[PDB]
């Protein structure tokens, strides 16, 4: 409980690590601004070494020093009372090559990754003739794959009945041992709600979800 790194403190109390393996002012718990989980929500996703770069001194290390090796750990916790119900899925997919809505092009940069701001899924299709937009129908999960089979990646179920939080540890997964970080995004954190959030009248109508990222052993 109350682990600290640099000049930040996060208080916790289970962990699921990578594929079995384990991974100077940059070692601090960055915290993206929390999103709101409503009834009619579909899901959110962040590209991992892009959401850190636009804001942190880790990103100040990025603009001086392009090429690097990093190893992440991710805390995700949502606080809700005993009267809410619903189930999440926290998964961290490597090399998420998403597909465009228009059949002949590829999506542009600002649609694949908001700088430390959560891009959101939807539960319909999207238009095709408009611009370079990410095909974001949720049941195909953006990669043309069945969303039920997504648990082959390292994942952790958040279920508000018993569990409350989820901690992941991801090692460095790349082919080249040293690649430029500005044109490449190797990890992708996805949060999809399967059982939608339901509550009675009188309780608060949304549950906040906070995402805490902390890089460990960044080599340059």
């Amino acid at each position, epitope marked *: 409980r109350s682990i600290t790194l640099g000049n930040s403190t996060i208080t916790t109390q289970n962990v699921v690590v990578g594929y079995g393996v384990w991974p100077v002012a940059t070692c601090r718990f960055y915290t993206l601004e929390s999103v709101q989980w409503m009834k*009619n929500s579909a899901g959110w996703w962040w590209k991992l070494p892009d959401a850190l770069s636009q804001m942190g001194l880790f990103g100040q290390n990025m603009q001086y020093h392009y090429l690097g090796r990093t190893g992440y750990t991710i805390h995700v916790q949502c606080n809700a009372s005993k009267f809410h119900q619903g189930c999440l899925l926290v998964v961290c997919v490597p090399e998420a090559e998403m597909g465009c809505s228009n059949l002949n092009n590829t999506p542009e940069f*600002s649609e694949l990754s*908001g700088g430390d701001s959560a891009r*959101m899924f939807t539960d319909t299709q999207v*238009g095709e003739s*408009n*611009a*370079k937009k990410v095909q974001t129908a949720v049941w195909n999960a953006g990669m043309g794959v069945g969303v039920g089979n997504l648990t082959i990646f390292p994942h952790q179920w958040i279920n508000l009945r018993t569990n409350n939080s989820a901690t992941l540890v991801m090692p460095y997964i790349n082919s080249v041992p040293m690649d430029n970080m500005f044109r490449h995004n190797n990890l992708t954190l996805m949060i999809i709600p399967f059982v939608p959030l339901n509550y009675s009248e009188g309780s608060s109508p949304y549950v906040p979800i906070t995402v805490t990222i902390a890089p460990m052993c960044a080599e340059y």
Partner: antibody
Amino acid sequence: QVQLKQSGPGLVQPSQSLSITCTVSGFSLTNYGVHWVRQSPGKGLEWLGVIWRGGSTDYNAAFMSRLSITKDNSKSQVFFKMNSLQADDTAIYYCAKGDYYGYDAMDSWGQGTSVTVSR
Amino acid sequence: DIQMTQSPASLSVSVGETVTITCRASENVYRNLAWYQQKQGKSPQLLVYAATNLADGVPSRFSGSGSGTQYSLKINSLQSEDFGSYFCQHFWSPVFTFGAGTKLELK
């Protein structure tokens, strides 16, 4: 949260150009796009054009030659120029942001400035 | 192009009734519909996006449904503050077009 406003001329000359600049507040421009909707009492509602969050623009088919939309990210205003300003443009022009939870719908709107073509 | 025909023209029902309203498309839109409400000389607001999902502050009186082409909205109980215009809008592909626009008198 304080929403977006706009500031326009209000009164024009027939067969001219128009310039309405829409001022936003609170949100960025790399995470949202704006929508330009003409509200008219005769032709009803009609959509004119958008500029997406990536910088690409799409226009209406009936106004392909008369529109030109642009924006500035850090200064945080958009600029669009309607041209040739015919007699059917007696209508109030709205500025509205989009991408309400990533769904491409107009969430909040400007105050609306009604323009009239005639002397 | 795709056209939206809002039906019927206008209603005048008392306070507290269950009324319906519908609008039709030309081809498939895959539930990419948005409902709007504008009172006397104000900016419109969003109530239902994607033809099922209510907005954040809109009460639970409104309800929408439909898939494919036949889409509809259902008010279960009117109040004195619910009159005005009502528009349905698809956002499938450019060009985005609106409906015609109806009106509730609330006699």
